[PDB]
Write a protein that binds this ligand. Structure first.
Ligand SMILES: CCCCCCCCCCCC
Ligand SMILES: CCCCCCCC
Lengths: 55, 62
């Protein structure tokens, strides 16, 4: 049994901050796209770039 | 690979910071460039006073 009364509707703002931080983490993942497949450990050689990116 | 990208960016930033440290040290050692360590001295006021004394030679008389 939860104990969240009508004052728990204020808590949408920290979840909005969670969404803002998650969006900024996704944008920083998009920013670091150099060496996405060019690394020597997980990178396939040339001629196989037609597939989808890993992340 | 995000660690690889951030390490490449931070290593290039460290290399450029070291290079600009040597560039600033050699610039401040010899005072060569006009930008950072140059203490500007002008001969504008000496030329202005010499020009004014040159015009005052023509106005001497009666
Ligand atoms: C006392 C009423 C509290 C809920 C309404 C005011 C706060 C709304 C916050 C909305 C965040 C997205
Ligand atoms: C500190 C940034 C707050 C606003 C983020 C907006 C993202 C769409």
């Amino acid at each position: 049994v939860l104990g969240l009364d009508k004052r728990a509707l204020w808590g949408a703002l920290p979840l909005l901050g969670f969404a803002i931080g998650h969006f900024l983490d996704k944008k920083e993942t998009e920013r670091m796209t150099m060496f996405r497949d060019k690394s020597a450990l997980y990178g396939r050689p040339a001629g196989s770039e037609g597939k989808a990116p890993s992340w | 690979e995000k660690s690889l990208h951030y390490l490449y960016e931070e290593n290039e930033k460290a290399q450029i910071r070291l290079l600009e440290d040597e560039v600033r040290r050699k610039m401040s050692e010899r005072n060569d460039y006009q930008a950072y360590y140059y203490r500007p001295s002008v001969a504008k006021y000496h030329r202005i006073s010499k020009e004014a004394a040159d015009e005052l030679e023509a106005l001497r008389g009666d």
